[PDB]
Design a binder for these strands. Structure first.
Length: 284
DNA sequence: TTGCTGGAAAAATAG
DNA sequence: AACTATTTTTCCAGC
């Protein structure tokens, strides 16, 4: 049986259920990196998959593979591979095999555990778009294609010769590291140019502007060179919520004969930095 | 050393 | 070719 085939959750007395859905969020790890864990449950544990209606007494194999996010087109995702985790914290044995270009990871579904299984041994590896897209015949695009689904399936051998094949897909999971949390970001400036002298006040409205927010003007080179840094004084004596009043600093060289492009950003901590804002100093 | 990550800087890209 | 604005990969540091 193919991985693309539209199997179903149930089939008469049989029914594959995802007792515990994974978290909506899970950062995948790259080859050039160390494992980033197994998919975790929103609670704190991990996902749980169970087969209902298996009165038989023989352990079955539960397959796991990462697939696309759209239900209508459950396909294994071309830019992600299930990753087999192992060792101490991993209460579930597991073997892996390749099927097509897909890594599939099998887990045991045991009658003694009521065909109930804990998926704490499956992590997610991220392939490089470039590498995948060079594969002849593939047309899926990687860029911005970071949602995926954990796809579970099992093959039920009926003593009557034929096998019932079931499958269940988890809720989508976001695999791209969400970078910000408590970051401050400018959305509206007030002034974007000024004379080398500065002294002019610039109003800045954005998000997450704390009582200890700072504004730093910087100048680079076309080769990304930090040739100028300079903190701007921010009227903290008073201010509206998410609105910072900045005093444009004087440009290092008041003798420039042509306008110079420069950047400024907002900082709340040694690592809490906004996106680089644009500014221009004009020769007097 | 294994994982295992959080946080990021460095490297790539789309327009 | 070079820019910016965004995304993706690689690195680094702390267990």
């Amino acid at each position: 049986v193919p991985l693309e085939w539209p199997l179903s959750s149930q089939s008469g007395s049989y029914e594959l259920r995802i007792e515990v859905q994974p978290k909506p969020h899970h950062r995948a790890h790259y080859e050039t990196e160390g494992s980033r864990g197994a998919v975790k449950a929103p609670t704190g544990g991990h996902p749980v998959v169970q087969l209902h209606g298996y009165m038989e007494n023989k352990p079955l194999g539960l397959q796991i593979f990462i697939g696309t996010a759209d239900e209508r087109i459950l396909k294994p995702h071309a830019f992600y591979q299930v990753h087999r985790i192992t060792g101490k914290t991993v209460t579930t044995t597991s073997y892996e095999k390749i099927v097509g270009n897909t890594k599939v990871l099998e887990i045991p579904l045991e009658p003694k555990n009521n065909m109930r299984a804990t998926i704490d041994c499956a992590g997610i590896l991220k392939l490089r778009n470039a590498d995948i897209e060079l594969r002849k015949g593939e047309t899926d695009i990687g860029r911005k294609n970071t949602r995926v689904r954990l796809v579970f399936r099992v093959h039920i051998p009926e003593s009557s010769g034929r096998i019932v094949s079931l499958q269940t897909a988890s809720n989508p999971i976001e695999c791209s590291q969400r970078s910000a949390h408590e970051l401050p970001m400018v959305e509206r400036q007030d002034t974007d140019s000024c004379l080398v002298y500065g002294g002019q006040q610039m109003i800045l409205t954005g998000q997450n502007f704390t009582s200890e927010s700072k504004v730093v003007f910087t100048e680079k080179t076309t080769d990304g060179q930090q040739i100028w840094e300079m903190e701007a004084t921010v009227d903290k004596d008073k201010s509206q919520p998410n609105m910072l009043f900045v005093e444009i600093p004087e440009y290092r060289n008041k003798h420039i004969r042509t306008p110079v492009k420069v950047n400024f950003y907002v900082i709340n901590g040694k690592r809490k930095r906004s996106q680089p804002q644009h500014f221009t100093y004009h020769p007097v």
